[PDB]
Scaffold this active site. Structure first.
Site, PDB file in Angstrom:
ATOM      1  N   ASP A 406       0.894  -1.135   0.000  1.00 22.97           N
ATOM      2  CA  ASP A 406       0.000   0.000   0.000  1.00 22.97           C
ATOM      3  C   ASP A 406       0.957   1.215   0.000  1.00 22.97           C
ATOM      4  O   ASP A 406       1.900   1.256   0.806  1.00 22.97           O
ATOM      5  CB  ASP A 406      -0.896   0.025   1.253  1.00 22.97           C
ATOM      6  CG  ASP A 406      -1.992   1.091   1.186  1.00 22.97           C
ATOM      7  OD1 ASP A 406      -1.664   2.283   0.936  1.00 22.97           O
ATOM      8  OD2 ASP A 406      -3.172   0.736   1.369  1.00 22.97           O
ATOM      9  N   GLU A 422      -2.709   6.993 -11.332  1.00 25.16           N
ATOM     10  CA  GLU A 422      -3.990   7.080 -12.021  1.00 25.16           C
ATOM     11  C   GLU A 422      -5.032   6.464 -11.058  1.00 25.16           C
ATOM     12  O   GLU A 422      -5.548   5.359 -11.258  1.00 25.16           O
ATOM     13  CB  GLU A 422      -3.937   6.415 -13.416  1.00 25.16           C
ATOM     14  CG  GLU A 422      -4.959   6.979 -14.394  1.00 25.16           C
ATOM     15  CD  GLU A 422      -6.401   6.597 -14.119  1.00 25.16           C
ATOM     16  OE1 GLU A 422      -7.042   7.264 -13.272  1.00 25.16           O
ATOM     17  OE2 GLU A 422      -6.885   5.620 -14.740  1.00 25.16           O
ATOM     18  N   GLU A 431     -12.253   7.699  -5.779  1.00 26.11           N
ATOM     19  CA  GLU A 431     -11.495   6.449  -5.573  1.00 26.11           C
ATOM     20  C   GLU A 431     -10.475   6.668  -4.466  1.00 26.11           C
ATOM     21  O   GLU A 431      -9.716   5.756  -4.149  1.00 26.11           O
ATOM     22  CB  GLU A 431     -10.833   5.893  -6.843  1.00 26.11           C
ATOM     23  CG  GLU A 431     -11.820   5.430  -7.894  1.00 26.11           C
ATOM     24  CD  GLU A 431     -11.222   4.787  -9.136  1.00 26.11           C
ATOM     25  OE1 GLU A 431      -9.977   4.730  -9.270  1.00 26.11           O
ATOM     26  OE2 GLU A 431     -12.019   4.329  -9.983  1.00 26.11           O
TER      27      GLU A 431
HETATM   28  N1  LIG Z   1      -3.046   3.068  -1.646  1.00 32.43           N
HETATM   29  C1  LIG Z   1      -2.733   2.261  -2.675  1.00 32.43           C
HETATM   30  N2  LIG Z   1      -1.519   1.656  -2.678  1.00 32.43           N
HETATM   31  C2  LIG Z   1      -1.147   0.954  -3.757  1.00 32.43           C
HETATM   32  N3  LIG Z   1      -1.831   0.728  -4.883  1.00 32.43           N
HETATM   33  C3  LIG Z   1      -3.046   1.300  -4.836  1.00 32.43           C
HETATM   34  C4  LIG Z   1      -3.561   2.070  -3.802  1.00 32.43           C
HETATM   35  N4  LIG Z   1      -4.847   2.499  -4.104  1.00 32.43           N
HETATM   36  C5  LIG Z   1      -5.079   1.981  -5.286  1.00 32.43           C
HETATM   37  N5  LIG Z   1      -4.037   1.243  -5.788  1.00 32.43           N
HETATM   38  C6  LIG Z   1      -3.989   0.547  -7.070  1.00 32.43           C
HETATM   39  O1  LIG Z   1      -3.977   1.521  -8.097  1.00 32.43           O
HETATM   40  C7  LIG Z   1      -4.628   0.988  -9.269  1.00 32.43           C
HETATM   41  C8  LIG Z   1      -5.650   1.953  -9.854  1.00 32.43           C
HETATM   42  C9  LIG Z   1      -6.145   1.516 -11.228  1.00 32.43           C
HETATM   43  N6  LIG Z   1      -7.535   1.918 -11.432  1.00 32.43           N
HETATM   44  C10 LIG Z   1      -5.258   1.976 -12.384  1.00 32.43           C
HETATM   45  C11 LIG Z   1      -4.322   0.856 -12.849  1.00 32.43           C
HETATM   46  C12 LIG Z   1      -3.183   1.312 -13.810  1.00 32.43           C
HETATM   47  N7  LIG Z   1      -2.272   2.283 -13.180  1.00 32.43           N
HETATM   48  C13 LIG Z   1      -3.759   1.837 -15.130  1.00 32.43           C
HETATM   49  O2  LIG Z   1      -3.780   3.026 -15.418  1.00 32.43           O
HETATM   50  O3  LIG Z   1      -4.231   0.865 -15.892  1.00 32.43           O
HETATM   51  C14 LIG Z   1      -5.161  -0.400  -8.892  1.00 32.43           C
HETATM   52  O4  LIG Z   1      -4.323  -1.399  -9.459  1.00 32.43           O
HETATM   53  C15 LIG Z   1      -5.181  -0.363  -7.359  1.00 32.43           C
HETATM   54  O5  LIG Z   1      -5.065  -1.650  -6.749  1.00 32.43           O
END
Ligand SMILES: Nc1ncnc2c1ncn2[C@@H]1O[C@H](C[C@@H](N)CC[C@H](N)C(=O)O)[C@@H](O)[C@H]1O
Ligand SMILES: Nc1ncnc2c1ncn2[C@@H]1O[C@H](C[C@@H](N)CC[C@H](N)C(=O)O)[C@@H](O)[C@H]1O
Ligand SMILES: Nc1ncnc2c1ncn2[C@@H]1O[C@H](C[C@@H](N)CC[C@H](N)C(=O)O)[C@@H](O)[C@H]1O
Lengths: 624, 624, 624
Positions: A406, A422, A431
């Site tokens: 995280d 993103e 989100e």
């Molecule tokens: N606090 C956090 N720590 C780590 N990863 C996170 C956290 N919050 C959300 N995520 C991750 O961030 C991503 C958000 C996605 N919607 C985007 C995925 C990717 N970066 C894309 O543009 O395709 C997911 O894979 C989540 O599991």
């Protein structure tokens, strides 16, 4: 194009159906009882009239009754008549005809709204609906322009009104609105909108925007005659046909042949020509196809681990990643000059790396910029970490360090020059991108950059009786009976009306160089409204600044070309609110939190107050 | 036939899938993590093992993960281990593997039931299910015969049990039953039944009768070798395959090639041969297709007016009308001798004439008998009266008088020699044929005949975990949360087990020549049970005497050949009841009434008491 | 003592009531229709018998009918008769009598259970209950010993059974159990238990332990005669009266005067003497008065801020604080010897100081030990911090530092020699004392002591049909219809039966000197049962070690004398489970968690499986 023929004369059912099918029509609207066969239900000797009361169900197959026939209420049936005898015979006849339609298994049944008072008609229809299930549709035949308002000015002692009556020109919309309010917004009650020779003013037309129009009735009499003698429509009538085709309405041709020299199928041939020559749909309209007014739960990638196919869907948007790449490319050139290009290695951290498309975008950006980068790919979803660690070993190599953590808990070995993420929803911060980035902020260098640097949500009041009905139907067992109105929905808004221009709601900046960091917010928005309408909710959009002039937007006026990653968000209201032209819609939105959850609260305070929606996040929360 | 290949060795996913598809298999069951790759979740240094933890989701398309792959739990995962360290690493590994399957969007996932105590396995699976929706299936791998019970008698100081243990031979059924009870009958949990070299005794096999079997696992080792050297099955194994094909289970081939001289696809070729050469289905099995265990509300033709297509469906049964015609033909010859054939006109009243097939059957019967009849066609449904009055005018003529009336309210001009009706439900009297005929009785001559003369309902106790789950899922909003268990369902019973022979429940006779006319009834039924089982409800059937030896039956042992008008009825119980072999099932059924409604009440009093179901008709009534 | 007179002969209602009131009785059980006045409902001429059917409601005031009269079913009413005519007249007569009782507004009505088969009696009573509301009680007259089992051995060719039948001697309990199962545990159906001349064996008596006994019937015939000639009871009958007085049952005197020389009121005078001379109640029984079987939500002092009056209630227990003081006093002497008493200042931290009683207990302990202490009073509840900071300023002074903080978040200036806390629930760890203390552990010196040092929870299987009914009634709107069975309740258990001795469930130690700190737990308990019964749930208790031999306990066998701070906890089961004598009850309990919540999960695996209760904490959680 789906078309039907409207007739009030059917000598023989099989021969009529056959002639109508030969013309190219998909269905026939017809009387199920002779339109002149008035029946008596109380007074002798006429109540004892020998049968059959109508023609046999055996004249057509069950499949033909279910697919080719739209039923019609007899024209003498007047449930709102001032004569009690007429009213009572009409109630009994309405039930008898609706019951015969249900017996036949008819897909739809036509009922007119040809006057202001349809209270008793509504009552008899509601009682019919609450007798079984049927699923069968009721098409309410309502004209754009009332017959009293289109009569010829040929009565010497009773002239037509030559005075503009803004609200009065909109009288048929109020006939429909009162009828469907009385019937309690039944999903089975829809509009069959009758188009007249002279189209009313724009305001009168677009009053119908977010209304459940299932059919559009074209009288043969509204058609003009072209040079060759064929029936055609005015340019304005063509504009209206194209707007109705966008709503996928069924088209009904009514009336006799007014172009005698030509075959009757020429009215339908022209309609089919307009359908064939309609403006083509864009890449977004092509992607969104099948999702029109379909309600979805907004994704929560922090609280839930996203499935492989959700990531695949995100990856299908090339515009979004090319924007991220361009932003990273621009930021790398501003941080490292030509002289340092071979010595200075920029630390880049992709926070929420998913399956890795941003990691690849950062690598392409560094090759484009001709600058050196060191990457960290942070991801909390351990399933996405499988994809990441396989990509790292097979292709990325030592340049990329995959971190299964995280971002708020992660102890970084180094500080970052650039953090890339993103974490944005359709309402930007829904989100919890502010909370995530706030927790990761400490491992960014003092002169460090966050991509995105900023995001802003937007709201716009909307009218849509269809979406109000869709939200209403989301009532569930074992929860508050009104919970469905106290939560947002991701939805490709289609059959709706935007009532005022979108205004900014909440803004976030990264990094957050403020001592009193508070992600809670309270906003008051004043929406000037220029039409008479019903408020059913608020559409939400967002805008983001990736870097300098490199942006992403879903706000309609600035919408990023060809980007389909986010559909709008819908914030409903429990109760529809009447809004008059010239009135202001005032809305209050709050972004709230505790240590475990984040949520929105909202209320309308003008023209009238609503209740506060989702207090304390009782119906909807976003998990931290 | 739908087939899958089970493997525990997948060097390369694309090459394995490809070789398996080439053999003719529809799917592959495979490990989603290396089966030997034991993982540590708590203790350092092994908890910090560098990734990837498994192979990438990117190796297959999303469509291929969703349709071609069944996942498998790693064999070292032991959540019910007596070693705490093994138990905790196993819980974390089970969640990790189930979560990876959900990430992949796998259609099914295999978990073994290879020992008695699976409490913690159940707990970890239930928690996984209550984390999202997924809809994904869990196939519990359970053998007919436990591995301890099929081991070779080769241990000199620990011999195999050569004593018959009736309940002990049934031990794997109890492993499944406890597991699904703990998991609270989840619709997502099903059986993958593993067939062994030596089939157990019949009782052990048919214990699985009404269980949700989704797959049948065939080890290559159970196959015999025929003269040509190809793998084949024993006649008893063939019998079991044919019973499993009737349940439409998916077949899984497990193990290595034990017929080396032949291609491995020969195991599947043989299976496909048996599928092709299965006993063909009858006209009833062909009609009932698609309705297997599909629950329906019993029709109420007295309270509701039936649609045109419901009457059309009734009319598709030629056996029912040819039986009615034969009965009328026989009764006409007994009432009018040859000498009177040209003078004596018999008054025949069809009570509930519908669209008229009984009116036509009476006319054909009179022409066959060479006797004169005068017909009255009584029908309360005014929509069916349209059909009747059109038939009367076009074909029947003056010989038939169509009467639009309730038979209980109708003032007859003449008295009838014969009254003909078809007011019977699947439980005979559940459409209120006794009440209707009692009300019409007064216009029948003293020596008058009723066709039907008599009817009898029958009940049989049944076991079906699938139907119990189907009934359970009928919980509705805005009503008693257990109402669905207190009502009968018309259902073509398929995946079930009849626990005892059907016994008569209620009988009615017509005419009712009794001064103390009471249609209320109270019955006590004692059902001897010869197997260990679970009671989930009662199947209901009926028999009727039209005239003398002319009958109609849905009771299975006397079922009228090729007659599909009535499917059985199901009376559920709120709580499943354990029944031991040798025990008696005692059930009490009541037929109750007031002036407005009729209903059934029921209770089990042995081996244990149930609550009284549907008291005062609170959940289910039949409108008068 | 509340007493009633049972009569089957009432010549005049006002005179009888008056004579009965003069004797000292609070109420009269009497026939509402003449007990010999058999009525016919179907067959003429007797069905047409001229009225009145009974005596007028006008003979008594409405208040007298509502408070002084218990109604009685006519003795000829036999709904389970094998003669159909008797059964039907009996059903109509039962309804007529129950309806007359409801018309009169009678507080209770007596119905006998004098044979095994009462299925139809149950059915007629259930239908009566589901006709209105009434709230009126139904007292089921059931003897301890069946009349067939107490008959004189005076039939030469049909001798009495001189063989012990363990389960057969318990036959009247099974008559009651089947009746109330059929009636679906109605809150309106209770037991009027008839005591016989010879009391059955203990096992037969205590079968009734957790049953809803509302009245106890004493025939005049069971009384012995003392030296002076007055009616008295045997010592064993006296023991039973005292157990029934503890349940606050109403006592009914039935039969004629068998002590003719004495006034009839002597039977009641004796009963009133026993009531007056009953063993007195202890300080706990006095405190618990009014809380008997009253269900409460367990307090969550971590998630919620406790009100001022909850703290006041905790402070009323002097035993608890004197135990804490004695423990602190003993620990201070072990850490600081006489030579160091004037130089060595011990750092003491009260973690969760509330309003300060532990702070005062630590100060009294230090004065007692003649040792020097430095206090820190940590409290997260800011409202309790108001009380603390006012006490500190007015009385404590600089010796006490009040800290407004969560103990898990607090940055301590110094390390503690002793940490003192009282974070224990009725199931010890259910207020999350392990999580709180684990978070505070780091600011305790290496040789530091935690008071409490250890705690252990205990479970015991219980039978209680009253508590099962109480839990059932906790169904709420807008939540899972069975949620109430998936949560614990703090309850002073009264009308129940403990089925096996309590066994340890979960244990916690402080400090937690383990690298792999895991507060999750999984326990399997095997309970040997020595009686035939019904399992309705599990009673929970705890024990704690404050310091060395200084403990606190609510486990009944070791219960701390005069300590009322904790009532037991109840873990219900959704479905009652039949248990035979000699059988083992096996239960599985899990303590589960995530970062935000802690919860319990439980299941019965023997003699039969239950569903897993509260999976994933769907019905009940403890907030972190
Ligand atoms: N606090 C956090 N720590 C780590 N990863 C996170 C956290 N919050 C959300 N995520 C991750 O961030 C991503 C958000 C996605 N919607 C985007 C995925 C990717 N970066 C894309 O543009 O395709 C997911 O894979 C989540 O599991
Ligand atoms: N009391 C009644 N009076 C008149 N018609 C009735 C009455 N009760 C039921 N019916 C009719 O009896 C019919 C029963 C049908 N299921 C059978 C239809 C037809 N006789 C056939 O065999 O196809 C329906 O058409 C009902 O509307
Ligand atoms: N993690 C925590 N940090 C600080 N105080 C806590 C924490 N958890 C519980 N408490 C407090 O501890 C107290 C527990 C009480 N039931 C006992 C009060 C007091 N010590 C007494 O014996 O009367 C409450 O005042 C809680 O607010």
């Amino acid at each position: 194009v789906s078309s039907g023929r409207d007739l009030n004369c059917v000598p023989e059912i099989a021969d009529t159906l056959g002639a109508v099918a030969k013309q190219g029509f998909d269905f026939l609207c017809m009387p199920v009882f002779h339109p002149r066969f008035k029946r008596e239900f109380i007074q002798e000797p006429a109540k004892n009239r020998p049968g059959p009361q109508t023609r046999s169900d055996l004249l057509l197959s069950g499949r033909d009754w279910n697919t080719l026939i739209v039923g019609k209420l007899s024209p003498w049936i007047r449930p709102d008549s001032k004569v009690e005898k007429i009213r009572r015979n009409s109630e009994a006849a309405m039930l008898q005809e609706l019951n015969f339609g249900a017996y036949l298994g008819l897909p739809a049944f036509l009922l007119p709204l040809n006057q202001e008072d349809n209270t008793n008609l509504a009552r008899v229809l509601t009682n019919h609906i609450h007798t079984g299930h049927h699923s069968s549709m009721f098409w309410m035949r309502v004209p754009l322009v009332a017959p009293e308002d289109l009569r010829d000015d040929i009565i010497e002692n009773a002239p037509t009104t030559h005075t503009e009556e803004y609200s009065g020109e909109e009288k048929t919309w109020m006939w429909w609105h009162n009828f469907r309010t009385l019937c309690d917004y039944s999903k089975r009650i829809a509009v069959a909108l009758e188009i007249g020779a002279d189209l009313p003013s724009n305001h009168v037309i677009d009053r119908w925007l977010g209304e459940p129009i299932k059919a559009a009735i074209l009288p043969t009499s509204i058609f003009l005659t072209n040079k060759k003698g064929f029936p055609v429509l005015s340019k304005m009538h063509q504009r209206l046909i194209f707007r109705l085709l966008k709503l996928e309405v069924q088209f009904i041709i009514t009336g006799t042949n007014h172009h005698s020299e030509k075959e009757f199928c020429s009215y339908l041939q022209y309609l089919e020509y307009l359908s064939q020559n309609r403006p083509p749909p864009n890449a977004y309209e092509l992607f969104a196809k099948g999702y029109e007014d379909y309600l979805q739960s907004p994704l929560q990638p922090l609280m839930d681990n996203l499935e492989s196919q959700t990531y695949e869907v995100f990856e299908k948007d090339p515009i979004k990643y090319s924007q991220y790449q361009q932003a990273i490319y621009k930021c790398l050139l501003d941080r490292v000059p030509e002289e340092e290009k071979d010595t200075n290695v920029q630390v880049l951290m992709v926070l929420g790396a998913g399956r890795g498309p941003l990691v690849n975008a950062s690598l392409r950006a560094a090759k484009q910029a001709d600058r050196r980068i060191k990457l960290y790919a942070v991801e909390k979803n351990p399933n996405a970490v499988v994809t990441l660690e396989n990509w790292q070993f097979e292709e990325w190599g030592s340049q990329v360090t995959v971190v299964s953590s995280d971002m708020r808990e992660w102890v970084a070995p180094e500080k970052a020059d650039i953090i890339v993420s993103e974490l944005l929803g359709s309402f930007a911060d829904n989100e919890l991108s502010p909370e995530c980035l706030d927790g990761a902020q400490h491992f960014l260098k003092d002169d460090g950059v966050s991509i995105p640097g900023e995001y802003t949500s937007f709201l716009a009041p909307i009218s849509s009786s269809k979406l109000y009905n869709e939200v209403r139907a989301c009532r569930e067992k074992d929860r508050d009976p009104e919970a469905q109105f106290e939560m947002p929905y991701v939805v490709r808004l289609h059959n709706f009306h935007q009532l005022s221009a979108p205004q900014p709601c909440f803004t976030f900046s990264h990094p957050n160089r403020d001592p009193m960091i508070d992600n809670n917010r309270y906003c008051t928005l004043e929406f000037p409204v220029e039409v008479n309408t019903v408020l059913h909710g608020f559409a939400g959009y967002f805008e983001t600044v990736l870097y300098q002039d490199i942006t992403l937007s879903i706000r309609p006026e600035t919408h990023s070309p060809g980007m389909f990653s986010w559909f709008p968000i819908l914030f409903p209201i429990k109760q529809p609110i009447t809004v008059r032209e010239g009135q202001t819609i005032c809305v209050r939105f709050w972004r709230c939190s505790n240590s475990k959850k984040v949520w929105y609260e909202w209320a309308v305070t003008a023209p009238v107050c609503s209740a506060i929606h989702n207090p304390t996040g009782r119906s909807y929360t976003i998990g931290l």
